[PDB]
Symmetry: C2
Subunit: 216 residues, 2 copies
């Protein structure tokens, strides 16, 4: 390994953090806006809480980028169109779809972090484990979803569709990002295929989770 090899590896880690930071900022924006539409006053804080956690992650990743001597905004820019597009294609119709979107984005991101944690250094891994969603955090959203599905029979069929839509749109953008501006295959053409194996693993865990909400 040469200083050039390491310098390059550090820049791909910067791409990863950049994508993350932008994902987190957007998720904060979306969840916070979505929170206003909650069916009860009791539920208002549900999405506001994950919104704040997301902004906290954004700030931690942003600071890491600066510490690496990298400009946060510059590192984020390349992923802005793809992240914005995904959200524009996953506009929730109501607060239950918002809740579901928060859950799906929370669980898939946590899976991804456990996946890529093996291919990065201990210091990058360290930042990822700080951001990584707790079991109990995710269970709070899951339980609120279960409860909603238990109370309304018309809900399941609509959220099952939505679940499938969220997966499709996130898979479409994952592939656009690996085509249009790749860093993942370099951290993981033949390397792009390893990236697909990771992506499919995420799809598979999402699907087990949908079944456990009694969704197809």
């Amino acid at each position: 390994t040469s200083p050039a090899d390491t310098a390059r590896y550090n820049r791909f880690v910067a791409d990863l953090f950049g994508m993350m930071a932008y994902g987190e900022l957007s998720a904060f924006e979306r969840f916070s806006a979505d929170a206003r539409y909650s069916p009860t006053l009791h539920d208002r804080a549900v999405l506001g809480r994950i919104a704040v956690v997301e902004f906290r992650h954004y700030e931690l990743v942003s600071a890491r980028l600066e510490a690496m001597g990298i400009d946060a905004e510059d590192a984020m820019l390349p992923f802005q169109a793809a992240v914005d597009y995904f959200h524009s294609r996953t506009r929730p119709a109501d607060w239950y779809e918002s809740l579901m979107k928060a859950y799906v984005i929370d669980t898939v991101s946590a899976d991804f972090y456990r996946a890529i944690s093996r291919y990065v250094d201990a210091g990058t891994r360290d930042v990822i484990e700080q951001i990584q969603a707790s079991d109990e955090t995710t269970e709070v959203l899951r339980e609120r979803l279960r409860s909603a599905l238990a109370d309304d029979p018309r809900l399941a069929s609509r959220l099952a569709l939505w679940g499938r839509r969220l997966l499709g749109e996130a898979l479409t953008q994952a592939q656009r990002v690996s085509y249009e501006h790749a860093f993942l295959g370099s951290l993981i053409a033949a390397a792009k295929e390893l990236v697909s194996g990771l992506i499919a693993g995420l799809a598979e865990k999402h699907s087990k989770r949908m079944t456990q909400l009694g969704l197809t």
Copy 2:
């Protein structure tokens, strides 16, 4: 007496209910103004402001919980008024958002300084933790220095904000009055009008300092 204590605690509960709901609401509205951010760096600007609001809401709701009051119950009476104020003051651009954040943060800080002396120590401490303004002020001041057209428009926006707030303060005095107690239900109503009038005066001086009519 344990009776007067109970009475006073119900009004401190009303105060925190209002504060918690306003802060929760501020969190949501300040964060929604993200479509206007001029740059990507500016997205973090309203975001941090909004997150501070949510943390205040959590601090105030925790206090209500420590008194054995459901936050929701305490907040409900102020929902209609606070929601109304916000629907009548939706910013149409970046600067109107900043201006609203600035006006709410400055007016509310004056409010806390006005009532602090009248509440117990445990309540004063919550308020004191609830008490970044120059960051907003210098954003606005530097914008108005480089764009004179903004002046007349933000001046109108400033007034609309003041008018819509005052109307709810007045409504909340008849609908669910608690403030006159914390500071004879005739002289109580007067003291609250003097308190409100003083918040308006400080607001108008702040508008002058920003160079607005």
